[PDB]
Structures are given as C-alpha cells and as structure tokens.
Design a protein around this ligand. Sequence first.
Ligand SMILES: Nc1ncnc2c1ncn2[C@@H]1O[C@H](COP(=O)(O)OP(=O)(O)NP(=O)(O)O)[C@@H](O)[C@H]1O
Ligand SMILES: [Mg+2]
Ligand SMILES: [Mg+2]
Length: 327
Amino acid sequence: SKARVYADVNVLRPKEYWDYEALTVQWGEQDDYEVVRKVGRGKYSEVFEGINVNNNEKCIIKILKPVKKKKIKREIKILQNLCGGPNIVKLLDIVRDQHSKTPSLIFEYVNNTDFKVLYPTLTDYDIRYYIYELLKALDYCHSQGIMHRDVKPHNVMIDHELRKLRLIDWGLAEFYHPGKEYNVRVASRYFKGPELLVDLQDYDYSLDMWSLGCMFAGMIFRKEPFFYGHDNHDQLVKIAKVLGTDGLNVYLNKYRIELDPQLEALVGRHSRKPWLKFMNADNQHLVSPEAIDFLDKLLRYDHQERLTALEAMTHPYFQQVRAAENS
Ligand SMILES: Nc1ncnc2c1ncn2[C@@H]1O[C@H](COP(=O)(O)OP(=O)(O)NP(=O)(O)O)[C@@H](O)[C@H]1O
Ligand SMILES: [Mg+2]
Ligand SMILES: [Mg+2]
C-alpha cells in the first residue's frame, strides 16, 4: 500500500527536512514564560496556560515528561516544518530547566471550549465550518509529508468566539515515506482506523481521514465517541457492527491480511447498517444527505478509497462555507 497523494514529498526533499533524529534544538530562555494554571495533560506531558513575561500575552507551556529523546526531536521538527500552515498550532519557543533539563514547548494560546460542552451547542453550519477548517490543516500537513496520527477532539482547539481552529498535538505525528511499516500503536482508541486494528503497518495520510470521519460522525449523530470499544479488538468489533463484515473481508483479502482467529471470532458476521439508523430526535437537524454522503466516503475500511483532505474540502457538503470564504 502507498499513498495516492503527496507520496514523494520527503523523497524529493532534502534529508534534513525529515531527518528529525539529527535536529539541533536552539534553546530559549526558560524564565520568559510563567505557568499560570494547568489546562491539560497526557501520559507524556503537563500543559499549562502561561504568560510571556516579556510582552504579557497568554501562551501555552507543554512540559514534557522523560521519554526517548527521539520522540521529542520528532514533535519539534514537525512543528517547525508546519509552523505557518493554515490552522497549524504555532510553536513559539523551546526551553529547558537548567537543573533537570526538562524540556518545555511554548505555543500560542487558543481560548478553547472543551468539546464535550462545545460540540452539542454547535449549529449545523458551524460543524461544516469547523470540519472545513480542520481539513485545511490536514491537507496542509499531508502536502508537507507528515501524518498527524492523533486526530481527535482534544487535539482540536477551537476559540468559538473568534471562530478560530488550531490542530494541536503533533507528538504522535510522523514523516510519510513510501513503503514504511509504522507502529500501529497510534491515535486514540475511538479514532484508530481499521488498518491499525488489523495490523496493516504500511498506512499513510488516509489514517487521519478515518479519524476525521469518526469525529464528524460523533458531531452529526450527537454520539461521542461514535465507535465506543473498550480495547483494540472490541474497537474493530464496533467498526464491523456498523460497516458490515462483507466489506471487511473484501478489505482483508485485498491487502492479504488474516486476522487473529480470536479477533476473527469476536468480529463475527454483521450486516452493514445504513447511516440513517443513527438518526434521531436530537440529531436530525444535522444528518442530511450531504453529511451522510460525505461521512460515507470517509469511513471506509480501505484507506485507499477514503477521500483525501483536498477532495474532502470540495465536497458539496461544504459549499456554503466555501462561498462565505470567497465573498
Ligand atoms: N495551544 C493550546 N491552547 C489551548 N489548550 C491547549 C493547547 N495546547 C494544548 N492544550 C490542552 O492540552 C491538552 C493536552 O496537550 P496535547 O498537546 O494534546 O497533548 P499530549 O500531552 O502530547 N497528549 P495526548 O493527546 O494524550 O497525546 C489538549 O487536549 C488541550 O486541552
Ligand atoms: Mg493531545
Ligand atoms: Mg499527544
């Protein structure tokens, strides 16, 4: 399997672009940024709203926990490669604690509204606008040869009042190389695509489109997360109960994949369930034909059949967003 678009970006660019184990950090001043209040975390870090002492503006401080040094160089190099791209979180400085050399990443501050509270207030149009904005970041990162690999609502900051979106958290991201087998232990469970769960390691930028589709399905069906499995195996079973197992078997045999037989038995045999069977009172003001048509072209087992970020932004579903953007 190879990417259908932007497959040669790293191929054609200099080794330094993508050779992040060779990064050379040019540390800033740890004192310029002060911690004001904890806003998030990961198994990987502590994230605080900070203040830039030199100009008084809010900032974000991402204090990294001890991990192999390559993991830190990777996240930094990707941020520097994308800095300036549409809706890509801006990395402002990199600083360390003299004593422990604990690295902290400094970012622009986005005044986010938690998605469990924001998403449910969104109008149909806003959903369209925000997914469109998130698509600009994904088309931009794919075009630069990088997969995000952790597309999910906690990694999408929205300042609703400013109608500003930033695709944050490039900590799992990677440079795309035609033919490389990648670890499949990436992304959040609800957003893991079929290829991660069936162990197809030579995946590409299309994994991010499956993750975007799960976010979209959650928004229009008012159901978070939309594929709610307790562990990986179960995550593939929740997928197979919606998409049907005929499609899966087509898919497994296309790429020459034999599932683990216990997994294979959990999965079982399920008829495809049309999308409209999730339509209800609460979500019917959001489930029209274009939404379904669009969602259907994102949530496909075959990563090769899924829309690319570029195709997705031109889908008719986003016509009004495009026109508003054009005048
Ligand atoms: N620029 C930002 N503006 C506002 N809030 C932010 C910003 N960056 C990060 N946060 C918050 O910090 C949380 C975690 O930081 P993030 O950069 O996603 O992750 P990580 O520590 O590498 N975690 P994870 O998603 O588990 O891998 C997010 O889910 C946000 O709520
Ligand atoms: Mg995160
Ligand atoms: Mg992360």
